[model samples]
Target chain A: VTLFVALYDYEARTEDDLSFHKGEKFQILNSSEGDWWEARSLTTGETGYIPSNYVAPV
Target chain B: PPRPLPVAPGSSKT
Candidate 1:
């Protein structure tokens, strides 16, 4: 599946389970954002917002 | 009166 790698870690305090760890891959669902992005974890299918800078195209 | 179009899923904002 197409995905990107997390360059750093982030904990989403505004949303539940919207956090992810570094080096984790996530299938990008929505990327049009100035701050956060929408994605689903490739390993767990957990979908949520992540800081855009935390991930990079892979 | 015209209503604002609802933003759909997958709509690109940028």
Candidate 2:
């Protein structure tokens, strides 16, 4: 399946497993700040956040 | 530190 995807950062993936790109904005309007966040691939539709720490700018 | 390099096409600042 085709997937519109971003790279792994934080949330489901830890900082060790994730590559935190600071200041990069994610259009993650699916969740509010301080709440858990996840994303769906527009193509593949797969969903998951990288990790909590790696996912910010909410 | 300098600004964070752009990895995505989104608005980025460091």
Candidate 3:
């Protein structure tokens, strides 16, 4: 199942980045593993690993 | 200080 979440003012270095705008919505593709969670951008459908801290369940 | 607005889909380095 896909989990909807919110990301506020999220950014990170290319070394481990999952850049997104404030208030942007994302779909958590999986649970946090290795401190990163797989996610899909709701606006762009871009999929990648984002830091667990950058997301909040919604 | 605050981060600038996201301009586009950023590349991941993970």
Candidate 4:
């Protein structure tokens, strides 16, 4: 699993989305989905879909 | 169409 860091704060718009703050670290579970990727927040331990562009490889 | 929409970095906010 690859680790990533959020580039900007993203508020969850839907139930399927994950809300995260800027500079938060995440563990990428899956990236096969287009535009969105499945990840788990290291701070929250919650898993959800986040925008691929919102995070960068750590 | 008079003008095209500007491209945003992320999805539109509600």
lDDT winner: 4
Residue B5 of candidate 3: its Cα lDDT?
26
- Model 2: residues >4 Å from true position, as ranges? A1-29, A33-36, A51-58, B1-14
Please give me the total number of clashing residue pairs in predicted model 3. 0
* Candidate lDDT values, in order: 0.66, 0.37, 0.62, 0.77
DockQ versus reference, model 4? 0.08
Candidate 4 regions with alpha-carbon error over 4 angstroms: B1-14
TM-score against native, each model: 0.66, 0.27, 0.60, 0.76
Across A1-58, the per-residue lDDT of candidate 1 in tens digits comes to 5578887666666664367677799887777643566788878877977666567888
Preferred candidate (DockQ higher): 1 or 4? 4
Off by over 4 Å in 3: B1-14
Comparing candidate 1 with candidate 4, which one achieves the higher TM-score? Answer: 4
Residues A1-58 of candidate 2: C-alpha lDDT, one tens digit per residue: 2222343332223432223334434434354533344544334444444434334344
lDDT of 3 by residue, A6-47 (tens): 544565566445677657777876763455677787788778
> What's the fnat for candidate 2, on a 0 to 1 scale?
0.00
Badly placed stretches (over 4 Å) of model 1 are: B1-14
Q: What fraction of the native alpha-carbon contacts across the interface, defined at 8 angstroms, is recovered by model 3?
A: 0.00
Worst 10 residues of 4 chain A by lDDT: A29-38
Question: How much DockQ does model 3 earn?
Answer: 0.05
Q: How accurate locally is residue A57 in candidate 1, as Cα lDDT from 0 to 100? A: 84
Better of 1 and 2 by lDDT: 1
Error of model 1, residue B8, in angstroms: 31
Local distance difference test, candidate 1 = 0.66
